């Protein structure tokens, strides 16, 4: 884990999700609030602007409810959005294309950003230029035909 201030809070939160991904995936499927309401996400929540925390949580929880109902368990997207579900949700009709953390820096809802960057070839997640670990259901990590020899 990292120790440099707000940045480290971000990196460390996504490292925790990756390291605990089996238990997180099952809880997200079966009983998501034991996950959304975990104290693990309190530091991440303090980085989200106070005036919009609840509106972001309403958006992500609603998105997850719809995802789950029609598709079940997109690993990268569940990991990305999860910490934003931690605040008490405020429901609204607002549709967010990005979500800000104070470190504003933007996490894009679809695809990669300077803050959150998943690499399909190495199968590792990078947060603010630091490694968060390897992402995974049926050998993990780097693809074939990367190392020439």
Numbering used by the authors: 537 to 609, 611 to 640, 644 to 676, 679 to 680, 683 to 693
Pull verbatim passages from the article behind this deposition.
To assess the structural impact of the typically avian glutamate at this position, the K627E mutation was engineered into the 538–693 construct, the corresponding protein crystallized and its structure also determined. The structure of the K627E mutant domain is essentially identical (RMSD of 0.34 Å for all Cα atoms of residues 539–675), with the Glu627 side-chain (not visible beyond Cγ) again pointing into solvent. Thus the mutation induces neither local nor global changes in the domain structure. However, the charge reversal causes a major perturbation of the electrostatic surface of the domain. The Lys627 side-chain is solvent exposed and forms part of a striking, positively-charged surface patch which also includes residues Lys586, Arg589, Arg597 and Arg630. This basic region is severely disrupted by the charge reversal upon mutation to glutamic acid. In crystal structures of both the Lys and Glu variants of the 627-domain, superposition reveals no structural rearrangement of the domain upon mutation and in each case the side-chain is solvent exposed and partially disordered, most likely due to multiple conformations. The temperature effects on viral replication observed previously cannot therefore be explained in simple terms of structural differences between the Glu and Lys variants, at least at the domain level.
Each segment is packaged in a ribonucleoprotein complex (RNP) together with the nucleoprotein (NP) and the three subunits (PA, PB1 and PB2) of the trimeric RNA-dependent RNA polymerase, which mediates viral transcription and replication in the host cell nucleus. The PB2 residue at position 627, which in nearly all human and avian influenza strains is either a lysine or glutamate respectively, is the best characterised polymerase determinant of host range and virulence. Here we extend the structure-based exploration of host determinant residues through the identification by random construct screening of a new PB2 domain (residues 538–693) that contains position 627 and is thus denoted the 627-domain. The 156 amino acid 627-domain is located between the cap-binding and NLS-domains and contains six of the seventeen host species determining sites described within the PB2 subunit: N567D/E, I588A/V, T613V/A, K627E, T661A, T674A/S where for each position the consensus human and then avian residues are given.
